[PDB]
Subunit: 390 residues, 4 copies
């Protein structure tokens, strides 16, 4: 039983403490869940289950995926649950939502991701009591999403490990980030992000403001200031504040159904899910995650690396993104033709489905047959999925 | 060709701030992952992916399921991820792990759950800054796991809604709790929990915990009726007729039936069907009602075909309502007690009662089983197990 | 046996989270102590003891008055201690420092106050441990300085008690506040605050910023905003954000010595301490605090109410200041001739010595013989001190 | 003008997280204020001012000394204020309260101290906001009372400096602590603490518990276990957990009035205040504080070191207490005859008046003519007072 993606949508990737500074993740997800159903003509009462990945749900209440579904009109008879595979959470939900229909336990699935790093609180265990001495108020964003629990250093330090073994110079990493910014400004001005972005109305006390543009994109990004930034994680390192992904808020999802179910409704699906794969690697080089994951996904689909017509590779770091391209050897001209996470933004829970939206809508805009989306997961993991157009 | 559970294990359900007061959830899961692999002869290097549900991972670091796997010997080549469907997380992970092998994306899966409510921290958003006035330190246990986000009241209040429409008196609810307590002490003294419980070494000297500490030995009824109501001053649910706050973990080994025959393993049970259905968030306790009816429908079984049933006892009112609704024989429901006496680790109760379900079916020679739980927010999960 | 004030100084009263947002209280006191000694030619090695009042020292370390003395050059041979009588702390230290020389236990005393509400932290008791339930992180500024411990409501509510029985309308209180606002900036534009204010150097990473003007003073203070403000503490109250004192940071002190000691050093003192008094009242009507305190101070000095040439009355609230003026019957034209704490600012621990600086430097500028400074203290108390010219 | 102490009282010195774990400081002070007034026959309506020292008032509300007076029956007509001179606060209030009557501004003064380290909260500045990164919740007890703000280390580290320069071996400090322990248990069993200790009723929902015994005193303290304790502040140091004072809660005060007023009331006073002194030293060697302070106190009174019949010297640390004994040369058999703070306990805000209660009641118990109480103050200071019997 095949399984096609009938429609997809996503919110604009906001900056850290920016447009979505006080917007909970489920409010951004409910807007997406309401958007994918309109773009396919499917009603909310037909959704069997909503599957939204999220890495930082602290303070959001019971089951944030349930709140995003109930507010979006999904009836109480349906179910909802969350997931945490770090940066591959948004894309794995599409794979998990695909398995719900593959086994015959569901027919219509809204799968994607959501994240709100601006709403990430500070936590500390105080049940036993602090009899004497100062204690730490732990930032859940840095701890539960940006700090490797096995070695203790930041996700930028494991990128320094990728910056050493592959021998990627500072100037080469700066040229990859600035190129990603220019590819983002060109696609945004040409309206290539309008199809994927659904407007979100940020209700405020001083008036509602509709946000529909990726705020992280720097207009007129130069290179003389890219080399003037100090390294953030190592005094003698290469990763800085510009060549790495930032902290962002946003959401993204898609509508999942069988191919025979879409043909009955007369729906033209965005793409066909042919295969998927997830492989783990050394936690010191988590950025190499997409390397075995993409090779396993293509092997399951029966495709050669040269068979791909379009590729979306999440740009968590400049060193990590260059290393994956230099190993797989795929044509960089078809990789992130509209930019990547360095310019658009990196919502951990939503980046998996965010770049999948960019992957789907760009394939039909250009008429591409075969695609491949993949991301690197912290702790030494990687996820990948292949999409073929209808 | 199906999908069987080769082995299963769980830690002793500790009390809130008790034996596992300072033990992280992934430390309890690694012991379970090491136990399910030991009881089936499967090595850690053969696990493709571990799927462990957890509701309160705040402060535990990146992917607690990944930490529990690396310490248990699972190699870095395997993958790991967490999931949150509240109370049905432990049982849904088995269903999710079942789907990994059904589509052919994996061969060996360690699926279960874990929870550590004692390690649940207090949180507060402080990025924007508090210029003036005091602010609230939010308990992640109460907020993210025990408070309905749609109506605002506690999960004990949703039991009052079930206590009214079915008209279940406090004395009947008190008789259900005391009966569950007495049925728990019988199994603990008789060593019927020893097979499922794997000892955990809590590192002034190491203390090995291997017995469910929440079980009250000699629970009476004169004190059950003297307790004040906990969630409503004119309510019926108290501290004895409702589930408590507990820490623990539980998991199982998932593999194909044709894969078990190659290893010469005698599996605990075969996963025949599963289902998850949502209900009115005002009556979340009714969750197992449509979930159990759909699970039997997919497998093709009548309610009377079941030989053993494990129904999580989140509250006395919700557990009594499901029994009066499904009409199954109560003598085969929670034969060794329930969550009122053993304990209710939210993320692990789904796989906890599955361990009690699996080990009791083979101990007695039962053919067909059914485990189910009630999920907050108006949801319910259920799974059916057939013996080999 | 007399005791004269040889010199005095104070820093510019900064706004809440304004210029002194990150300046500790002892840094503001050290600048004053270095200023109190330099303007009189007295060296630091001659100071017997420094007495600085402070209400919110949480998080500043052991004895902030000791830190303010060591940084100002006072040698280790001297002693230091803090004091807390709420709002009358700055003026009480001068009375306490006067008693050190009166009994013969000291010769040179640097007495004053300091406050830094911007650095006031949030606190919560967590030694016993919070096993279950949410708990509150209490602001030390509101709790230990702005909340009456006997009845629980804010200091704005106890001003409402003066606003009800005394029957002071909002429009009359707004006319009293606007008059105080206009009188404060006039002294700033005419440079009437330059002599008493010592410049403070706010050390910054992007360059040092010298602060020498009271920023809390509203430039061009009109009445169009005074009548449009909603009540702050009670939906049916009269005190708002304009007619009440604000939250401020600052410090102030003075040099205390015997009259025969100033003549030996050839110092012309600012004023002679003639008497002082502190009397308690009903905590519900703390604004009446200065009423019995001033009557006892004049009685100890032997002066009638009509003998006063200049009066400084701290403006904690518009309602409390109006009630004191009509009961004592003194001429309002000599009361707060250069404005008050509503416009200049109200550092609780320092306002006692702040208005004393305005009292001291203005008496000879105008040729006043006798003065009287007073403040209202929360919890039903009042402080007063009388000053005679040399 | 003389000034006698008509009566005095104190609560039992509780252990850290012990009997007074959740008892606020003002509740402990109110019991003392009500006891000192009853033991002298003076009514509450005659109290002119209450002077209570406290070092950690964070979280207790506006003026904890005012709360302890209002609950103890002191009428609103009286005033109250706090002070912070660290460990010498309790004894300095008696000296400051003495100066109130010496200058003629008061007649009856209730002076003393109080402390409740168990109720000391954790604080953190959060007005500016924590955009990213973890932050510290600072323990006010360790920071504002147990950490020198000039060098950063604990008060045990400056005791290590006293343990080095004077060349005090570990065995000598251990022999001093065990001797103080034995002298404390003997006085408690012989009922020598019953007169000074007033019972405190800890009201609780599960029943009231009357506390009337110093809980910190270890019954049967040997030296074989004193040498088995690890050093607390330096891995190669001498100060441990047994030879140093602990963390404690409690209160203490006294009644101050003129000598001619006590004869009219038929009151037999405990002693006559002849002199007092406070001198500062190097904060690195605060333990030498009592050395010049006690020599200056005797110098003002006109007494030789050999004229003293009884001496109370606060035992904050074994090294500092031995150093004072080795310099002054007084007979150690008359110094802390009933033990010290090493065994009884060290409430910072109350230890100044705590040892004064032990000093006063012991002079009449044995018939001693002249006494002397002194303490070492953090930050390089020391306080001392001389007591003559009537
Ligand atoms: C790197 C990180 C710490 C950035 O926070 P930061 O250190 O404060 O740096 P900022 O992004 O806030 O910007 C800081 C400065 O860099 C400059 N800058 C940033 N990006 C730039 C760019 N792309 N081009 C030019 N200048 C840039 C800004 O103008 C700013 O200048 P300023 O200091 O005068 O204000 C944060 O984004 C991070 O942790 N990333 C980790 C990525 C990650 O973990 N991914 C996980 C996937 S596995
Ligand atoms: C609130 C809650 C945590 C109980 O905490 P609690 O109110 O402090 O009650 P406790 O369990 O700590 O025990 C309190 C008292 O009950 C008494 N008690 C407890 N269990 C008893 C029993 N089984 N029989 C008789 N008496 C009992 C104890 O002696 C104790 O007396 P004490 O207060 O004098 O010490 C519990 O009601 C709860 O919320 N459980 C979670 C339910 C839930 O949300 N489940 C979700 C699944 S959908
Ligand atoms: C009155 C008080 C409560 C105000 O706190 P606040 O309102 O939360 O702080 P704000 O700055 O936001 O209020 C100021 C607002 O009014 C406006 N405003 C206030 N006074 C004004 C004036 N005099 N003229 C013109 N505009 C004015 C400001 O522009 C600002 O704009 P906003 O309405 O959009 O917020 C504060 O001054 C206070 O704490 N008073 C009590 C002090 C005290 O108790 N002292 C001890 C007593 S002895
Ligand atoms: C040592 C200190 C830093 C903290 O240590 P601590 O956490 O209190 O030590 P603990 O209470 O946890 O227990 C210490 C051990 O020593 C033992 N011990 C302590 N004092 C003892 C004594 N006087 N005699 C015999 N045994 C003793 C205790 O029984 C305990 O045994 P344990 O190991 O089984 O716990 C603290 O006590 C201290 O010295 N604070 C300084 C106070 C201060 O400086 N005030 C200002 C004065 S200038």
């Amino acid at each position: 039983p095949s399984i096609v993606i009938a429609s997809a949508a996503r919110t604009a990737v906001g900056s850290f403490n920016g447009a979505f500074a006080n917007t909970p993740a489920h409010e951004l997800g409910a807007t997406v869940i309401s958007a994918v159903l309109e773009r396919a003509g499917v009603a909310a009462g037909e959704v069997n289950e909503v599957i939204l990945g999220q890495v930082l749900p602290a303070g959001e209440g019971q089951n944030p995926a349930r709140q995003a579904a109930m507010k979006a009109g999904v009836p109480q008879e349906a179910t909802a649950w969350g997931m945490n595979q770090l940066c591959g959470s948004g894309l794995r939900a599409v794979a998990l939502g695909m398995q719900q229909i593959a086994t015959g336990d569901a027919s219509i699935i809204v799968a994607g991701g959501m994240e709100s790093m601006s709403m990430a609180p500070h936590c500390a265990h105080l049940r036993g009591g602090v009899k004497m001495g100062d204690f730490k108020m732990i930032d859940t964003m840095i701890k539960d999403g940006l700090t490797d629990a096995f070695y203790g250093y930041h996700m930028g330090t494991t990128a320094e490990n990728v910056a050493k073994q592959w021998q990627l110079s500072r100037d080469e990493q700066d040229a990859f980030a600035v190129a990603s910014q220019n590819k983002a400004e060109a696609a945004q001005k040409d309206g290539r992000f309008k199809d994927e972005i659904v407007p979100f109305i940020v209700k405020g006390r001083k008036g509602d403001i509709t946000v529909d543009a990726d705020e992280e994109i720097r207009h007129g990004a130069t290179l003389d200031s890219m080399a003037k930034l100090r390294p953030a994680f190592d005094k003698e390192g290469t990763v800085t504040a510009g060549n790495a992904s930032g902290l962002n808020d946003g959401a993204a999802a898609a509508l999942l159904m069988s191919e025979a179910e879409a043909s009955r409704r007369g729906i033209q699906p965005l793409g066909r899910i042919v295969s998927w794969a997830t492989v783990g690697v050394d936690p010191k080089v988590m950025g190499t995650g997409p390397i075995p994951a993409s090779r396993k996904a293509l092997e399951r689909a029966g495709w050669k690396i040269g068979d791909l017509d379009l590729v979306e590779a999440n740009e968590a770091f400049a060193a990590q993104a260059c290393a994956v391209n230099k190993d797989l050897g795929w044509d960089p001209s078809i990789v992130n033709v509209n930019g990547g996470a360095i310019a658009i933004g990196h919502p951990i829970g939503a980046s998996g489905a965010r770049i999948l939206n960019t992957l789907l809508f760009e394939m039909k805009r250009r008429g591409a047959r075969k695609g491949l989306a993949t991301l690197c997961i912290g702790g030494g993991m990687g996820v990948a999925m292949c999409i073929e157009s209808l």
